[PDB]
Design a protein around this ligand. Structure first.
Ligand code: MAN
Ligand code: MAN
Ligand code: CU
Ligand code: LI
Length: 218
């Protein structure tokens, strides 16, 4: 149970919920066919924002995670909630109106299982920071940035995987082109994916991270 509550970009750490469509409730999405998968919603209604955060292309941003909106650095997520972390971008005409539901998404970050250490565990232990590299080669303009943590502690059953995501409203600044291939959310995940329907208690130090291949600048 966790929420992407604030974003650091270009040397500024913005306030809780600034530019981020945060739910007040920290519960999971478990149906990967739901439109709620894009930017949360449904059982976790989100709070609208009229703010857009400036982000330099080619820079690293930091998605900061907390158990609840007012939690501190020792209360990111239950350490049992082992799984991957991921991040996606979608180019949008207007970050104040686009719901993120549908096509246009591309993966820009993923952290799976590395010699016994899960991506979520690293975010928990490093103070709730998920590090995300914004591609250098993409066009300026408005985007949604979707950051995600997936807990797999109950994932050996269908729809047992727990997905926690929020969308930040950003304006990317600074030879440019979008990726050739983009994807739909919902669409990228299926309940039978080998990284979602999985028994993590039988792994020794390959985990197949769900979703499309990460975009790399050409
Ligand atoms: C995810 O899928 C790959 C096959 O591409 C496997 O290496 C892995 O065990 C998991 O099933
Ligand atoms: C660009 O290249 C890197 C590997 O060097 C991948 O992480 C990415 O998926 C894309 O192929
Ligand atoms: Cu939880
Ligand atoms: Li490409």
């Amino acid at each position: 149970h966790t929420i992407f509550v604030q974003l650091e970009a270009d040397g500024t750490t913005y306030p809780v919920s600034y530019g981020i469509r945060t739910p007040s409730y920290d519960g999971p999405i478990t149906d990967v066919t739901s439109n709620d998968l894009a930017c949360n919603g449904g059982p976790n209604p989100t709070t609208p924002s009229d703010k857009i955060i400036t982000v330099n292309a080619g820079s690293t941003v930091k998605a900061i995670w907390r158990h609840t909106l007012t939690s501190g650095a020792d209360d990111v997520m239950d350490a049992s909630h082992k799984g991957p972390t991921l991040a996606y971008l979608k180019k949008v005409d207007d970050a104040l109106t686009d719901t993120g539901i549908g096509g246009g998404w591309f993966k820009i970050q993923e952290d799976g299982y590395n010699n016994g250490q899960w991506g979520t565990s690293t975010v928990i232990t490093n103070g709730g920071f998920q590090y995300i590299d914004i591609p250098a080669c993409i066009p300026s303009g408005q985007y949604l940035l979707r950051a995600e943590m997936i807990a797999l502690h109950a994932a050996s059953s269908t729809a047992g995987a727990q997905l926690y995501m929020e969308c930040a409203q950003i304006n990317i600044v600074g030879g440019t082109a979008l990726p050739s291939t983009t994807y739909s959310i919902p669409g990228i995940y299926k309940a039978t994916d080998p990284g979602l329907l999985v028994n993590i208690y039988s792994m020794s130090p390959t985990y197949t991270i769900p979703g499309p291949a990460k975009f790399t600048c050409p």
